A paper describes a structure:
Vaccine candidates have been identified, including Schistosoma mansoni venom allergen-like proteins (SmVALs) from the SCP/TAPS (sperm-coating protein/Tpx/antigen 5/pathogenesis related-1/Sc7) superfamily. SmVALs are characterized by a single CAP domain otherwise referred to as SCP/TAPS, NCBI domain cd00168 or Pfam PF00188, which is found in diverse unrelated proteins from bacteria, plants, animals and viruses. SmVAL4 is secreted at stages linked to invasion, which makes it a viable choice as a vaccine candidate. The expression of SmVAL4 by yeast cells lacking endogenous CAP function restores the block in sterol export.
The structure of the first SCP/TAPS protein from a schistosome has been refined to 2.16 Å resolution. The refined model has one monomer of SmVAL4 in the asymmetric unit. The recombinant protein is N-glycosylated and is a monomer in solution, unlike some other reported CAP or SCP/TAPS proteins such as NaASP2, GAPR-1, VesV5 and GLIPR-1, which were shown to form dimers. SmVAL4 retains the characteristic α/β sandwich CAP structure and a large central cavity. SmVAL4 has unique loop regions, including a C-terminal extended loop with a terminal helix. Only the CAP4 motif is present in SmVAL4 and the CAP cavity of SmVAL4 lacks all but one of the signature CAP cavity tetrad amino-acid residues. The absence of these histidines makes SmVAL4 incapable of coordinating Zn2+ and implies different underlying mechanisms for the function of SmVAL4, independent of these residues; indeed, these residues were shown to be unnecessary for sterol transport in yeast CAP proteins. A similar cavity was observed between the corresponding α-helices 1 and 4 in the SmVAL4 structure. While the residues are not conserved across the representative CAPs, there is sufficient space between the equivalent helices to facilitate palmitate binding. These analyses reveal that SmVAL4 is structurally able to accommodate lipids such as palmitate, and it is possible that palmitate binding in SmVAL4 is akin to what was observed for tablysin-15.
Author numbering: 4 to 158
The structure:
Amino acid sequence: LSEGQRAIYNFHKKVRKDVKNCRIPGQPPAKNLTKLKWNKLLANKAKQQAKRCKYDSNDPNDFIIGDFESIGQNLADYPTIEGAMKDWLEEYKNYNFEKNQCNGDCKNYKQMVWNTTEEIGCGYEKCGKNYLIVCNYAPGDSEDRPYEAKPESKC
Ligand SMILES: *[C@@H]1O[C@H](CO)[C@@H](O)[C@H](O)[C@H]1NC(C)=O
């Protein structure tokens, strides 16, 4: 993994560890989340997409990757990788787990804490001032809640 790739991978590991341990503010802790494994095919497809330097593109070809049945995707148009990661994460401020409802945009946060997601790979390209960052996830998420809650005492 590149420098950026490794940082994006660890930031996702850390978010998922945090949500299991009451460390995402105002969000119930998660009972279980599959461990993410990096996947080279997701990462390369992410990278071919990000090299176009088009944020909206999307393009259902970008969602057909090897044999995966379902692919989710988070996109960021941002001057730094860490800023992008933090922007996706803090969408947790908009998300109500009990009602499964969102005020504004929750899609990036929900995909990061999606309990059945197993494979991740991410790709980014410098496109002028900013990066286009593409993360692909397998399986992708749905409109449901991201995980099963567990009692905050188990933290
Ligand atoms: C993920 O969450 C769903 C409920 O939203 C739960 O029924 C399912 O068993 C969970 N699966 C895993 C692998 O954690």
